[PDB]
């Protein structure tokens, strides 16, 4: 026979190897596939889909339909934001439970950009202006309206549209501190006539084109 020489690695099974293997059923009638719609190539595609962030995880509001209903309540102009959110997509309970976030449990590194979308869940007759803010990493949560307003902010008029979208720029993982996303009463809620003074809002985060991942890990029990 041809002179051959056995090197280290022979007879050892690599869990994530790439070798050719002998087939148990030669010539089997493999049913060919059909164009069932729902063909995916990657996981990130699933992450560039909007997902209702369950902001409210209070004692009762955690694990019931209210976890998604961030009420615009009758209080004063107390500048401590209507909503607060820490940009730790996997290291933050509200973001770790998202479609995007679940995928972020399957890697150690994620990098790129994300986007927040808000649905105003109030009357056509109701109006007002709110403010969406993002202070990139380093900066702390901006405690007063002004502080957030000073930086990247979006003034969103209710009485003009129900759809608000503010994209988040550059970030990176190792699953320890990132950015923050916040909502503020720019103005306040204008109620027309005798209309329920406490309506809600719905937030949807989704990844950006530039968002991808690296180093595959897990967790199961």
């Amino acid at each position, epitope marked *: 026979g041809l002179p051959v020489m056995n090197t280290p690695g022979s007879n050892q099974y690599l869990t994530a190897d790439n070798f050719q293997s002998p087939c148990a059923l030669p010539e089997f009638d493999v049913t060919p596939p059909i164009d069932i719609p729902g063909e995916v190539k990657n996981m990130m595609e699933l992450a560039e889909i909007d997902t209702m962030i369950p*902001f*409210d995880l209070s004692a009762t509001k955690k694990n019931t339909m209210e976890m998604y209903r961030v009420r615009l309540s009758d209080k004063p102009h107390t500048d401590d934001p209507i909503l607060c959110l820490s940009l730790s997509p996997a290291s933050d309970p509200r973001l770790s439970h998202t479609m995007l976030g679940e995928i972020l449990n399957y890697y150690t590194h994620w990098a790129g950009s994300l986007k927040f979308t808000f649905l105003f869940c109030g009357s056509m007759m109701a109006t007002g202006k709110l403010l969406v803010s993002y202070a990139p990493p380093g900066a702390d949560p901006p405690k007063k309206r002004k502080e957030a307003m000073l930086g990247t902010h979006v003034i969103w008029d209710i009485g003009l549209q129900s759809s608000c979208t503010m994209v988040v720029p550059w970030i990176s993982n190792t699953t320890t501190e990132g950015g923050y996303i916040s909502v503020f009463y720019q103005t306040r809620i204008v109620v027309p006539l005798s209309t329920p003074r406490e309506m809600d809002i719905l937030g949807f985060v989704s990844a950006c084109n530039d968002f991808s991942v690296r180093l595959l890990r897990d967790t199961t029990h």
Partner: nanobody
Amino acid sequence: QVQLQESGGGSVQTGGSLTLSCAASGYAVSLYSMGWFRQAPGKELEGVAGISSSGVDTTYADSVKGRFTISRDNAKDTMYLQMNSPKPEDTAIYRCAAGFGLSLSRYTYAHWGQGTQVTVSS
């Protein structure tokens, strides 16, 4: 992870001074700000008190300012909710975990503790 464990609650003669605690079973106890939410039977868990990230700010609800007190222990994790002079409405279920804010539970520090029922009986 910081997992919060609530202590300090129960019955008191209306007009006492109940100090309520909440141990942080995690490193970043120095995390964010802090707070105490109360919820009446079937009613919402409104933001009562709050302290800062360091343990410096003092933020209270309209009812509770002047009497209620909050103080997070840096060294020994737990924040102290001292309900100076508790009243009939202070007969609510108390919760903790409010780092990054006050006012509403519609935000703050999501990972919330269980619960302790305070019954102001005079």
